[PDB]
Homo-oligomer: A and B are copies of this chain.
Amino acid sequence: LATPSPFDMEKMVWLDVNILEIRKSVLENFGVDWSKQIPGPFAAFGKDFV
């Protein structure tokens, strides 16, 4: 004849979460940028024998 409870009282849990992030960066661009591919010498010949 005994009956159960409507529900059981559970235990409560507290959650504490921490997220930490640090970012650092450097960027350098120094100097002189010369050309590396340049035209060279040329030579041509032409003649009419007849």
Chain B residue with minimal CB distance to A42?
Answer: B35
Interface secondary structure of A, over-half rule: loop
Q: How many copies of this kind of chain does the complex include? A: 2
A36 B29 Cβ-Cβ under 8 A: yes
Q: Using a Cβ–Cβ cut-off of 8 Å, how many residues does chain A contribute to the interface with B?
A: 7
| Nearest chain B residue, comparing its CB with the CB of A33 | B40
> Is there an interface contact between B36 and A40, defined as CB atoms closer than 8 Å?
no
The answer to the question of A9 belonging to the interface, with a C-beta cut-off of 8 Å to chain B, is no
Instruction: State A33–B40 Cα separation when bound (angstroms).
Output: 8
Please measure, in the bound complex, the distance between the C-alpha atom of A36 and the C-alpha atom of B27, giving whole angstroms: 12
- Produce 1/0 per residue, A8-40, CB < 8 A to B: 000000000000000000000100111011001
Interface residues of A (CB under 8 A from B): 29, 32-34, 36-37, 40
